[model samples]
Target: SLLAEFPTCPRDEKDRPRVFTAASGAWLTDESGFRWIDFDNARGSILLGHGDPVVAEAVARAATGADGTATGWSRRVDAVLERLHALCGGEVVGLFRSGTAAVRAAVLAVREATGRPLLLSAGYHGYDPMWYPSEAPLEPNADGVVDFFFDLGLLRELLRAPERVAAVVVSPDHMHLSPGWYRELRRLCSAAGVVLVADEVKVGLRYAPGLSTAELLAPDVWVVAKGMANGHAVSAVGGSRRLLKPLKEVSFTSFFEPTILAAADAALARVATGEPQRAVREAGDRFLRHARKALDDASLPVEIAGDGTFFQFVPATEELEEALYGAANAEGLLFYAGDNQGVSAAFDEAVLGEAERRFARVCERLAPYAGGEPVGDAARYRVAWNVMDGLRQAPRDREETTGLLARLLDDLEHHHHHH
Candidate 1:
């Protein structure tokens, strides 16, 4: 099946992928007619939820237009871009087909404007090979990209030599920075003339309904996508007039797809009211509180954390991680592969209860394997991964360390054979 590949499907109970046929609100129906509550929210794209009638109607109406003059600069496209700029606090806007395209364009424009070859980035910036090179201060090859955690002082030191840096890109997850830290960052970037790029692809509109993360952080470049059109595909890179003027030489899609143009206009209008984001955050807060207590009572070795709108469950071991995914699917609940869950405005108290039930059922199903040798190895591997996660200042909380004792027992048993 087409879902057996990289992204379309994720691992499930049968150790394969779960394919869906239809979706509406917070539920998805598989081809066999089984429906699952969508806690992942289409990888955080469907902030309004699947098959939002408002977005669907807008898209349907736009789809009927004459296709002759569907370029990126159509009157409708320009109007929508203007609204986005007004809401997001950017002086200019350039549209793209996806988030990655927008970021790439932003980086290119920054490099051209600064006449520098280096880029500094933090957090996941899609799978573009250009962005995810080696970690920072390593004198990376060709593209000269460096990666670092926001907590690390390396970014501060590197900015001292900012003549070499084209831009510094960060995501909304770095919102953990204190106000003082943000001020320092702004001051340093201003002093060194470094382009501060906010890759707000995932948490942009959700973080603030009408404003881009760029508006809050005041970045030189703001990249947005994902929730821009609910589930439709669209992206934009917006920034100061001076910075964006360099982008005029950039190209765009032949016909900037009217369906998504209408979709973006309607979705942005809905998000501007701030009601949908408020609903999602409230629902997520309630869900996290209930989920934490329920999982704790069940003795499930998983920790949940994130903002009220986006959350994740960090299992103590890969085996448990695998178990949770399979069990959740078996119980008719959907979660992301690494447990990055998101909520939509459509989710409510009833949906929250169902989510807790599904999680509890998965814990019950994995209970029998809780103390096995495989579990011990899994614990050791998980601790190794957690050590790296800790470097980024995020670690999963654990209820027990007895799993290490199991690994010790296995080590003792193998000692005689090795000797």
Candidate 2:
């Protein structure tokens, strides 16, 4: 029961949770000694790879040598803050143990700065009831928090009272919305005087070593985690000095904890080089290409979508979806069902080759189930790709959305008859 409750553990049919014994570049070892190429990559936390030697060395070094926490000033904290300043334009950066904390502080920073009553959220920003929508998915909560779901006009409608809305927190879905979407959103926030926050926790360093959204549409405040520290527990929320001076209000005990800050310093150093992220994109491209071919070879009905760093399978039926991921897991190919799958820099050619082999075997085993039955609604399986309702059923007017997903569902449902 604890295993099931402990944030998403993979269990076999008998309900036995798979236990991890160790991890290495792009792979995890179970207690049974089965090696798994984890596409989930610690839920997209491991940037370079699991148990990176350099990061581990830094952790060990700091854990054994640091004694500067009691007095206050710490070099490791300065190191990452300075790096973040250079990277994300946040004069004041507050560190935390998870994206949830980081996001909360960012929300706090903006709200306090503006003294506004309402907040409009656009994407998933981890699990916090404060981030929860009140009435409907689009309705405002008691905290005055609501989600716009990337519907430009809906945001426009909600922002009718710009002064009432303190911040617009957005965790952008990479592939769905165009750059134009972000530009429009940026203009919207600017016109409304609302603080726009980029929740870059998941896509932080994966797409670009620096803030990927910075060039597209810069936000006044931001939060980053999951993609930094190579799986270490560290996240930061920061913005301009004027906006974040209220950070003094949000406090944490581990702000200067030697071991954790050490991990942050080490991870930031590697990320700044741009080597790890570069490697991830390259390897991810290869994986996406080979994975498509592997699916084709088996004549499976599942299709791969999105870019290399993160992608998902579009399956025909709930049965086929379960079968595909289950078979893949059995072959040492791990999938995080419905969550975005990620790859690390460790997924070099050699590791990817091995992964492809496992993928091929998985497809072969599930080949017979191809186009079996079109069970339930086509929209139900869209969950595999969409997390927030912006993905659920947002049909913007002809020019904005034009039924992008409706057409997809129609085709998916139509395929059952042809086969």
Candidate 3:
């Protein structure tokens, strides 16, 4: 059924959920035959670019194998474990049916073993009661079990009490966790003897390209998903050998065999290679470099966040976001919406150029609202961290980009005032 007639999700839809028919490299074709350079890459998978050759061959061969199961082991599974342990430098690994399932197991393992019910979270974690056992509510009448320490100082203090807390879950790069925060977290979690679980679901292999955070940050336990299998049903929990033993439920017998091992082995083999992560990082870096330059030229209040490989930018206004989205989508560039852009390794020069151009167009659409004299790039490079500084550093074409900006300005202003 059309979404208009069959509203499924309870949340307000943002961009209409696009239905796709085919994908290749970094591009997607929709039902109407519209083609898009898929920057978002299915929420940052397709790391090896869509339809990766080696991974496809392996998966095809696996499908022709003689076995399938629900929870039993396969020799191929043994190879997967060996590869994962090696890729992650020998930390023990456990596989699950999906990212959420792995996370649930990770969280449960921490709580059950520690006998501590509390958790410390940075930004968002998966939605599950195991990780959230707090009585505190987010909004008035909001219901769920949850407790968190958002403040750095308080979080540090909570970590000091170590035994009282079960785990400190963080995703190293994608939002929070300053270098100082990690250093401090390391200290506090160490002092309190707290388990620090890095949720590397999205940023798992993507951060640092080839090395898992398990190999890099060396969190006590880290969850891995996304890149290894393109878009498959598998996730793994990597942790210190002694610490992870509690995760097993082998005592409980089951009737069905585990077929997930096939997919797990296939996925693990792919992750054995660093191509996916490297491709995403390289493409992301290139796209951000160009997009930042374009945004700067227009003298807009926009800046990319994080390391730009997997980052977000804050636009000057809501209208800027809409205009940028429209202009970018019209061209073949598609990343994220609702105020951010997501990039993938499949993004080539064409995708990057389209985004940069669309951003320039968004600036033209947003110029009148800018209300200030333009700045130069000379001082722009100095304080690149600040939006205004970068705006000063970049060049602009106020005349040509104006039409896009103008329509965007009118529509956005209308949207702002009436609502």
Candidate 4:
């Protein structure tokens, strides 16, 4: 129903349709009492794991607030801002209920400050129309919005055009680019006087120690959300006063709800300790080592790519990717299909061990298919693809979407073996 009626669905919803009853640390218990190790961890939102006592206790106390109402701003907001300032080195901070909204506000603030309409962006920056243009032409000769990244030539050409661009927003993931490349970007943006905005919504605190990216490549404007409050909804857009002060011209949101601020304070406190980041990185490294060995032993055509805290499965073909997802579900594991996997601080040595076992099972099921043998009947695979395509082409709600697909895939595999 959510897929049809609403555009928003969990990124990993396609893996299975089980409803989760509860979560603790690195595990999720479904309604039917099936417990699985949660590698996705709320799309990297649960950095400290599912339910940390420190964060929960802090949020619980602020739930009712000092006056028993969850309204109005309190000292909690100030505390979170101060903590963020120390980490991110921003002159002013603004809070919001979602990362997309925070990025929207940041874009508006940068545009207002520069009095220019053009924007250059890289990586996913949410669904804000300012960054995502639907029916408009882009860049070089038009309204001047460029979406390319790590391309020095395009950027140099754009920068050469005088005062045409207002802001250049980038993801912290671009930190993978060489130091010289980043320095060139920083220098170009500085010379052009363009506001450089870092959209650190997904890779914020987890990417580095206090700051989200390299200190020398620090953005004039930075937006952080996702793991900011360890799954509680909150985002921060902070930068220099010259850029943020112009935000007064834009309408403000009722973003300073006390509970979120309190949660953020607690989350930042844990972040300051540096335990969660270290734990997640260590656990992720362990899992990757095991996963690589298993996949190599199976000679699978899939490769995993990502850092210690976040990674993704890259199958050589979409068919192989789909098969891997089904194989994982059969092995009592879940992932975001062809997308990234998030690692959490709660994933200890034991959790990593269990995850490796599950992944081994997944590899066992996928080996035959990966070694050039069809896992299912070709006709049934075609039918399954048609059904999925029909759902995409036609806009109707199908309550039995998950069950129907699972049953069809099962029949496809079953018939191939027996008949």
Candidate 5:
């Protein structure tokens, strides 16, 4: 049950999730009053910090202002759009309640424009059924989505059938890829006249918003969430207004809600400055260096990779990784084992010092599970990614928007109405 990335480290006597009563800068207070150095940071969602004062203040202000008269469009839209313009660099097409909603809409817009049914992916898109391929999929897979797995040759081959392919929605894993890979991809997509969508929900605003990705790939459509709103439910899909008119059809009631946009309006003001992210980058770098040293010193066969902003661990074996996680959880330092571990602006010198001490102890405690070649990079990566795949054991995917989307829409509707 303990997947990597967003790791809920401990459990209670009932073997249930740990009870965290409160959280603040770089730390969480357990029900029993222990402090946890929150390295996961809500899977890197809490960029500024947990319950950031500025963000909380804006949310409080907008939430309290919500009334029957607060109808039609949101007042926070303009400020959020201005910030998004500076950060994302495109015409906003659709505002969403989550990354999944934005990705679905972005994919739909391109599909309608291109008159193509196939969708190619690079990595995790969302928890939507349309993303998962059905049993009898198109040529490659069911959902008509094929994963290139960073192979340019395969991507080129797949592009040969551009008539059937709608878009290549990529979650740029800069850790496993290079600039040339992206540049070549842009070339391939352009030559074929296919839409290139950058799924920047993960690395959208940490070290680079759409800045680095756009400069490198120049993707036609890009969707960003999480990092923009500081844990608030908000996402946006934007592109050239010329091609995404169909995006108008992609609708949701909270598309322009005030309280959530208020969070983005405030968070992006700080995110636009690069101060908080700068802290995140520095913290990530030092943490990775210390983590590497600790692993090597303890003779644990683990390697740390990726930029300081987002990094992952690759151990020689899953058993060793599990032991490593056990040691970490016991020591009060939680991380996404084999998956990306990150920090935020709150991970200052004192917090980093304590985190280093805790991780060092984690490595030291792994005396019984050390000594191996650590495997190859690709192998390690696959081993790590499989930690949290929901369809890891599934035989095939289900249906699509008209059908696949039925689940989420119904579920959301039920929760939307309350006492």
Candidate 6:
């Protein structure tokens, strides 16, 4: 009974299947001992698959103390960091406990070096209150210190002033940032004599393995976590030669022991090859193509953004988001709150096929409720292309929308909400 009540993020009952165990390659047993296809792939981790020989070996070796130590700078950590730096396109790499920690530390590092407040351009930046400058009042607020730079011209103006500014933080590629914006921001930071910090926690390995956002933007500091150790939990903050020196002057050091250190090395070794990333990239693309075709066939009112690697499926309305996800889950599939889906290298061809087939069914069923077939809305596409995803963009009327959506969902549930 206790097992049945383990608290998880609120998920639709259909999406929360009774998974009991997982093993090598593909197979997950439910509470009933029935195995379902694992298309979700551990939220885009478990690359190369569960109990993968390579990943298992890496874990085992690290656990046995054969891979090296977690503290005091072991040779293994040094070698791994070196390889990580090189993989990051020659940028300096600093490993941390997780991406969240890396981001917070990077913010602090910039604040200390420049003795000024941080200017976060757009999108999320870990859990630091400073990153939520806009959320705080216009008056001087210490917790949420990051200044907003939604307008490029305003950002340029801020850069010119740069008296109390330490860093301009931005994510490399997300939902809002345009492709051209990456290079432009980096160049501007250089001109302003300010440090550019790239938060690549989720985007790092997904895009092009090895290279950090800092390298992508040529920023002074690069932040990476999430895939740094595959599914293993670790984060890192790398710096340019000059920026990294400031870390030394800081008074405190987060101590490292053994287990976590070993995990980092193991993850780095696998990601260094780029093999896993390639596999996921291909698989993700395949899945997206299949989903798109199905949505088109069903005549739903929806929009798909991003390619294979990461994508968001806007159901045209909150009602649709609920209906689409509810339908998909009934057929035994998983999606991130019906907003988006992601993929990692561990997925294979067979997994992609099943996911597409299931999604096609969901689209076909929900298409009619939304009025017409999924059409290409130019206005939606224009805004969808931007890679600036974050809390600021979230709806202010979320609660009201949910109330209205709940009534519509009741109608949707009565009709077949297949996966």
Give per-candidate clash totals: 0, 1, 16, 0, 3, 19
Looking at model 1, residue 204 earns an lDDT score of 81
**Model 4 shows how many backbone clashes?**
0
- Give the range where candidate 6 is weakest over 10 consecutive residues by summed lDDT: 385-394
Higher-ranked by lDDT: 4 or 5: 5
Ranking the candidates on TM-score from highest down gives 2, 5, 1, 4, 6, 3
Give all TM-scores, in the order shown: 0.82, 0.88, 0.74, 0.81, 0.85, 0.78
- Candidate 5 lDDT over residue span 332-386, tens digit each: 8767545677788888899999999998888878988767766554345444344
Off by over 4 Å in 5: 1-15, 66-70, 134-143, 209-211, 387-419
Q: Local error of candidate 4 at 82, Å?
A: 0.2
The 0-to-1 C-alpha lDDT of every candidate, in the order given, reads 0.69, 0.75, 0.56, 0.69, 0.72, 0.59
Distance from true position, residue 369, model 3, in Å? 4.8
The alpha-carbon lDDT assigned to residue 74 of candidate 3 equals: 63
Cα lDDT of candidate 5 equals 0.72
Q: Pick by lDDT: which candidate is best? A: 2
Question: If candidate 6 were superposed on the true structure by all CA atoms, what would the RMSD be?
Answer: 6.8
lDDT of 6 by residue, 175-196 (tens): 4456566666677778887777
Model 1 per-residue lDDT at 133: 38
Please, what are the lDDT tens digits per residue for candidate 1 over residues 2-107? 5532553454556555678898898899888988998777678888888899988878887787521465456777777877888777789988887877888888
